[PDB]
Amino acid sequence: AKHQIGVIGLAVMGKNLALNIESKGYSVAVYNRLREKTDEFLQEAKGKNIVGTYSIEEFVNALEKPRKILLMVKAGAPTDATIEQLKPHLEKGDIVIDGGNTYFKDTQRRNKELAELGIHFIGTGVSGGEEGALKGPSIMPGGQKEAHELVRPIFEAIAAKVDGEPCTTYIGPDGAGHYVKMVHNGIEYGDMQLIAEAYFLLKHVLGMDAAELHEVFADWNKGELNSYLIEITADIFTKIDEETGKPLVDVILDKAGQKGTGKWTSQNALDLGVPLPIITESVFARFLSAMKDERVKASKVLAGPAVKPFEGDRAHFIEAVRRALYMSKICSYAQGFAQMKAASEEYNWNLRYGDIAMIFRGGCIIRAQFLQKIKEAYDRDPALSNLLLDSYFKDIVERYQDALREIVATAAMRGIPVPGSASALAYYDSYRTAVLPANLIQAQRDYFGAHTYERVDKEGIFHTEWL
Amino acid sequence: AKHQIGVIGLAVMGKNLALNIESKGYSVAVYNRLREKTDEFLQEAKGKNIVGTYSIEEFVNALEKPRKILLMVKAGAPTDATIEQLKPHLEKGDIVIDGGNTYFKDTQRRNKELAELGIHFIGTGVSGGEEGALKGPSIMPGGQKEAHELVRPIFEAIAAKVDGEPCTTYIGPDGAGHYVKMVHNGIEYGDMQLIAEAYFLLKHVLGMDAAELHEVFADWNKGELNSYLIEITADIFTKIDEETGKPLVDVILDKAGQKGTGKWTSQNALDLGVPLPIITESVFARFLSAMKDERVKASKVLAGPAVKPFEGDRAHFIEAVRRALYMSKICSYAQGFAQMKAASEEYNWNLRYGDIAMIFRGGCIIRAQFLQKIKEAYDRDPALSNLLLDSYFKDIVERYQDALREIVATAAMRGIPVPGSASALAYYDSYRTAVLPANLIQAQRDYFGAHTYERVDKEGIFHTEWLK
Ligand SMILES: O=C(O)[C@H](O)[C@@H](O)[C@H](O)[C@H](O)COP(=O)(O)O
Ligand SMILES: O=C(O)[C@H](O)[C@@H](O)[C@H](O)[C@H](O)COP(=O)(O)O
């Protein structure tokens, strides 16, 4: 018999997506190199319209033309080796979809190589984790338009929906979807760091235990901060470790891990020439936390300030931490969306930033009502160069900046590190400043490397003989 | 005949090095892919023991064996293309030296490829701008030790000297030299930002004009901040523009350019898992400065804080800025040398940090008295994991931290951007803190992604069914 779509790669992620697809009424053919994974899945999927296949050739010939193939294998060599194995069996107009957390430049290369053979390639971000894949992920496809239209109904049936809108859209050509999935990941790290900072601030300035941290974050999730990450943070602080009777979170080693994918947004921001301080500080902050042994060692030798207990208005401070968090979150998204814009211009993608905010509204980890406000900003002005300039975000920052300045000043004086929040404040004060101190930098570079400069008053290039 | 050393690539950097080599008694042959650069240089080099050659074969045949060839061409494809031109003609035991601003993995590759052929390869950082190349640069070579020994007298002859010692040493195997050169360049970016922030603070908090600013910086260069960058800064603040009667600095457009190599230290830190906040903020600050139009447009619509004029002790604030600047620089170097330690362990380079500190002492842009203190820290402890643990630097930061706190708080309250200095403080506060909020991050990661965590009280990898 002929099946509607094939999935290669049967880890939980691939299995759940194939289950999602089948529940939406499509017939699914599966293949996995490690034989046992297929055997297990077929027992897991009794009664469902999923068939196992046992070679690449069997798999390919079990599918309706034009063929739809979802790769969910290990990044790098195994993905390419599978694509290589598919090539002889596929025909002009067949569609290979890579759904892993792939570096967009890899997707660009595979797209280009397959195209020469008339085979289409879609690199797609899948967000939501393992449960999300089963129930409704965010899906971020990029590749040929003609190929996307063929697979679009499948994407649209399996994605999460907000207000009848599927959390999927055609992102753009080549590696656009994988690019946007990378930025999602970056933004995710920033949010987690900014929240970690709000926690540490409450813990140290106010001496808050887990139970009252629960209350605070639970309240926060009833307002503008409403989001999956805040939601789960409120719940984390309720958990009691049985063995010790301590809050579970206090027993967990403060050594933040990360996949090698974590650093990609920051590294790409550096290539494009776009400032991404908050997300980059967030990545560095994980690295510094992983240096736990160095840190406890330095704690016995390095002195902080000798500050007395906090005696100010406690309710005021809680709210100031909240507003500092929300403003910082805004600067981070402004930096992240400004990155996607530089990428769109550079790779010629014509990205729609309102559409991107729309797919982030559910399914994915950064999902929050917040993403609605971003969509609206781009609805109103598609070519908006920075989210800070939109009237909604502009109102917030003019009202919340006092709270962010107080938090930065207070953290500085009490010895509480707030790398993300501080760089958020510095970014805000740099972006709104017409004349920066880069005139001296420019003067210096000319002085020692005769790099030449431009002037404030005249047009054209200049070079002084300083020496 | 036969000349002692060859130079390929006659941009100003390669011409000056050749000139430099010649002035130390060596005979030099030169070649350039674009013929007119050679003709031009030869007009400039009459009086000098330098000859031009016009093919790669002629070039190679003009050199005494073992051949010593210095490559000063554009990075990437053109370097590789020149190496390819050279390969048919080189003989076993010949030495090619890439003095370009080369990514260290490229050097690693070229080193391997050339080694299989019996040809040695040295990738060398050369620092100090064009005047340094001419008068005395810092030379940071990496490669086969035996090959280095053969070029060592030439490096030592031309390098800058400080108190009789040349600013050059054997860095390590393969790409180690170009790696240290990269980090030097990262550190340079950080120092320039920290200074720019010092400037901007005095300018907006104290209302200093270019005359008061000059004073401050000249008075700083007589102290522990003594350095080339601070010296030229004190100088820059004296230049008046004739056709405006304005300080020239007030007339230069605030868009900081950068070479494509500028981002590399930060990108690599990300690869190695090392915290490099200050240098990276400095790269990003240059990117922000380049966005000049967005900033003017934004300046009309975005609100700053309400600020009364500054009322506190003015001499105190200048000293706080000075101290904030010195401490921040300490944190940046602490970060940058920690990155070198990481790369050394990763690539098995057995880096000698005191030696590196000593060759940064002259020739290169970041040259400063301060480097002696770094050298001494590694004398006391070669295996030192972070400079903040050394008694000199520990004592400085504990003394000056109060100043840095004041400057970060003041900047916040007054709307003055201090990205580099604020990240220095956050870094200090993070590094000295035994228990950071990453416990929450680990909880979150396990909650939504089953990533697992570790516990403070026992060994093992743990997962929680968070939903119940
Ligand atoms: O749900 C998702 O969005 C994906 O599964 C994935 O993008 C993941 O969250 C990141 O790669 C970060 O994971 P770490 O926090 O483990 O680095
Ligand atoms: O002296 C050096 O260090 C090098 O010859 C060279 O690498 C360069 O002068 C700097 O890297 C400046 O870089 P920018 O042009 O980016 O300021």
Author numbering:
A (entry chain B): 2 to 468
B (entry chain A): 2 to 469
Task: Give the exact sentences the study uses for this entry.
Two crystal structures of recombinant Geobacillus stearothermophilus 6-phosphogluconate dehydrogenase (Gs6PDH) in complex with the substrate 6-­phosphogluconate have been determined at medium resolution. Gs6PDH shares significant sequence identity and structural similarity with the enzymes from Lactococcus lactis, sheep liver and the protozoan parasite Trypanosoma brucei, for which a range of structures have previously been reported. Comparisons indicate that amino-acid sequence conservation is more pronounced in the two domains that contribute to the architecture of the active site, namely the N-terminal and C-terminal domains, compared with the central domain, which is primarily involved in the subunit–subunit associations required to form a stable dimer. The high degree of structural similarity, efficient level of expression and straightforward crystallization conditions mean that Gs6PDH may prove to be an appropriate model system for structure-based inhibitor design targeting the enzyme from Trypanosoma species.
Two isomorphous crystal structures were determined. Data set I was obtained from a sample grown in the presence of 6PG and NADP+ and data set II was obtained from crystals grown in the presence of R5P and NADP+. In neither structure was there electron density that could be attributed to NADP+. In structure I, 6PG is present in both active sites of the dimer that constitutes the asymmetric unit. Crystal I was frozen and stored in liquid nitrogen within one week of setting up the crystallization conditions. A pronounced similarity of the two subunits in the asymmetric units of both crystals is observed despite not employing noncrystallographic symmetry restraints during refinement. The overlay of 467 Cα positions of structure I subunit A on subunit B results in an r.m.s.d. of 0.53 Å; for structure II an r.m.s.d. of 0.70 Å is observed from the overlay of 470 Cα atoms. The overlay of the structure I and structure II dimers, 935 Cα atoms, gives an r.m.s.d. of 0.29 Å. The phosphate of 6PG is positioned by accepting hydrogen bonds from Tyr190, Lys260, Arg287 of one subunit and Arg446 of the partner subunit. Ordered water-mediated hydrogen bonds also link the phosphate group to Asn186, Glu189 and Thr262.
